[PDB]
Amino acid sequence: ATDMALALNRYLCTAVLPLLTRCAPLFAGTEHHASLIDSLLHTVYRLS
């Protein structure tokens, strides 16, 4: 219910999430980066 949370959700869904949507193809080369992307998956699932 906090308003800062609303502002941060607006920031994410307006700027960060699209950028990463359309920066998708470069994500293929992550075989031997195994942690940060796994963290991002869980953060995105919690956001959803």
Side-chain angles (χ1 to χ4, degrees), residues 27 29-30 32-43:
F27 271 121
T30 187
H32 89 276
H33 291 267
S35 188
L36 72 170
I37 190 67
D38 268 343
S39 300
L40 177 136
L41 294 173
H42 308 162
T43 60

Side-chain angles (χ1 to χ4, degrees), residues 15-36:
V16 181
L17 301 171
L19 185 64
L20 305 191
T21 302
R22 1 141 68 136
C23 295
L26 306 179
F27 271 121
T30 187
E31 300 294 328
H32 89 276
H33 291 267
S35 188
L36 72 170

Side-chain angles (χ1 to χ4, degrees), residues 2-27:
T2 60
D3 63 358
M4 183 279 288
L6 285 171
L8 164 65
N9 300 333
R10 283 177 260 134
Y11 166 74
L12 279 161
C13 291
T14 46
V16 181
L17 301 171
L19 185 64
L20 305 191
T21 302
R22 1 141 68 136
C23 295
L26 306 179
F27 271 121

